[PDB]
């Protein structure tokens, strides 16, 4: 049992809250936190930059060792690394970046990675700096993920739009 509080129930297994995922991870210390990664695990900005800064750059040092050994991930793929001070594990998931011309169909493959874990704290994949429509990202999440997902949405106006239009 992870100590999530204040989430709104959208479906049987999807919950949502207006919160920064970094602050939710620091407080809850969940079994799994999802990072919105790129294929190189270069955590510069957005959710990845913010989670990495909260680990004092330990997530980036571990990630560079992983890439030196294994090479890059695929768009739609994932890897499990340490959660450091934020969680037991971090599931690094690569959603398509539409600003780079990546195929939005890969968003469903990205969310399929969540089904390997019973419960996760996660952001909306491919939203924010990745350029995709967040309303579409929540619909793909609800229609793909079967395990328990707790979505932390940073922007209040987007949170209100997501709930109202669901």
Q: What is the per-residue binding string for ligand A1AI9 in 10-29, x denoting contact by CB under 6 A?
A: ----------xxx-------
> What residues contact 43, with CB distance under 8 A and at least 6 apart?
35, 37, 49, 51, 52, 59, 60, 63
By CB under 6 A, name the one of 111, 114, 150, 154 that touches ligand A1AI9. Answer: 154
Check residue 153 for interaction with ligand A1AI9 (CB under 6 A).
yes
DSSP 25: H
- Based on CB atoms, which residue is closest to ligand A1AI9, 29 or 136? 136
Instruction: Describe the strand order of the beta sheet including 14-18 as a list of residue ranges.
Output: 8-9, 14-18, 148-153, 119-122, 32-36, 89-93, 78-82
- Based on CB atoms, which residue is closest to ligand A1AI9, 50 or 120? 50
Residues making contact with ligand A1AI9 (CB under 6 A): 20-22, 46-47, 50, 123-124, 127-129, 134, 153-155, 158
């Amino acid at each position: 049992v992870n100590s999530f509080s204040g989430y709104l129930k959208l479906t049987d297994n999807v919950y949502i809250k207006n919160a920064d995922i970094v602050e939710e991870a620091k407080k809850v210390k969940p079994t799994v936190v999802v990072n919105a990664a790129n294929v190189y695990l270069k955590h510069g900005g957005g959710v990845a930059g913010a989670l990495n800064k909260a680990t004092n750059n330990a997530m980036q040092v571990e990630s560079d060792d992983y890439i030196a050994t294994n090479g890059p991930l695929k768009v739609g793929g994932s890897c499990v690394l340490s959660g450091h001070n934020l969680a037991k594990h971090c599931l690094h998931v690569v959603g398509p970046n539409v600003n780079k011309g990546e195929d939005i169909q890969l968003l469903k493959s990205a969310y399929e990675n969540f089904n390997q874990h019973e419960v996760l704290l996660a952001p909306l994949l491919s939203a924010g700096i990745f350029g995709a429509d967040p309303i579409h990202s929540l619909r793909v999440c609800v229609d793909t993920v079967r395990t328990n997902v707790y979505l932390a949405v940073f922007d209040k106006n987007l949170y209100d739009k997501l709930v109202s239009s669901f």
